[PDB]
């Protein structure tokens, strides 16, 4: 009951329509630290602590 | 398939449309069957589970 | 609602009212909306006719026909308007208003068409609430704010509306920006 027909005698009877969506994302910051004494790396029994 | 496109401008702007502010892109094609044999095509029609 | 009414032999479609008098010699053709809803500008009351013509036939306006023998011949067509045209607003609010306290916005509008008696009337929304308090006094078209605080910031709508009942609508936002109280 929809399929496009058209007669030899001329047009405009078949006209169509677009829709076009939109999609998102978002970014986010994200960190982290620790403190330390010079000593606790010249002292401690481990070399390779750092 | 047969597509003619008229950009706006000084293409599509005729007496009926002097500035040129509408364009389209129309595709029309030929289409026929022919069934010589139509004992070999067979269907089955029954329900499908939901 | 627009009815249009054209004639065989002048080729005049006139664009009478919704309740209108089609005139000798003429025969209805159809009715469309002017402010077009879904696109209320990019439309024109020429673009209305037309597509009524698209419909009619060449041999008789009445007894509609299509493409082969259609009225397409917009040239030879005269478009005798004779209607209300529509209340276009030529000059808007401005969108957003930057104001320090003490300044003064003169928000303006400018209106032509639709009956003679046209009707102003000014609106106000809180800056964070939803419903729209009516401004009392106004029933002008330009308002004054002087001597602006922060309490006066918002939205400021104004609605013009005719002796029939076409109104059209324009809002803008004035942010007074201030000292912390």
């Known amino acids: 009951s929809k399929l496009p027909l058209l007669t030899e005698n001329g047009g405009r009877v078949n006209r169509v329509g677009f829709t076009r969506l939109s999609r998102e994302g978002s970014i986010h910051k994200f960190g982290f630290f620790y403190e330390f004494t010079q000593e606790s790396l010249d002292f401690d029994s481990d070399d390779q602590l750092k | ?50 | 609602e627009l009815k249009v009414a054209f004639n065989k032999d002048t080729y005049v479609a006139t664009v009478l009212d919704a309740s209108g008098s089609v005139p000798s010699g003429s025969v209805n053709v159809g009715t469309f909306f002017h402010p077009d809803e879904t696109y209320p500008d990019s439309y024109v009351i020429y673009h209305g006719v037309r597509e009524l013509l698209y419909k009619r036939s060449e041999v008789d306006p009445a007894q509609p026909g299509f493409w082969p023998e259609n009225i397409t011949n917009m040239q030879a067509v005269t478009i005798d308007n004779k209607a209300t045209a529509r209340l276009v607003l030529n000059t808007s609010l401005p969108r957003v208003v930057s104001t320090i306290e003490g300044g003064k916005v003169t928000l303006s509008v400018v209106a032509l068409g639709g009956k003679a008696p046209l009707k102003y009337k000014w609106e106000f929304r809180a800056p964070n609430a939803s419903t729209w308090t009516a401004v009392s006094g106004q029933t002008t078209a330009n308002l004054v704010l002087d001597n602006i605080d922060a309490d006066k910031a918002g939205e400021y709508k104004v609605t013009v509306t005719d002796a029939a009942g076409t109104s059209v609508d324009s809002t803008a936002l004035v942010a007074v920006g201030a000292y912390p109280p």
């Open chain 2, 1 to 50: 398939f047969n597509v003619m496109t008229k950009m706006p401008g000084k293409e599509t702007a005729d007496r009926n449309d002097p500035y040129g502010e509408t364009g389209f892109s129309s595709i029309k094609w030929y289409y026929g069957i022919l069934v010589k044999r139509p004992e070999r095509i067979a269907v089955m029609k029954a329900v499908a589970p939901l």
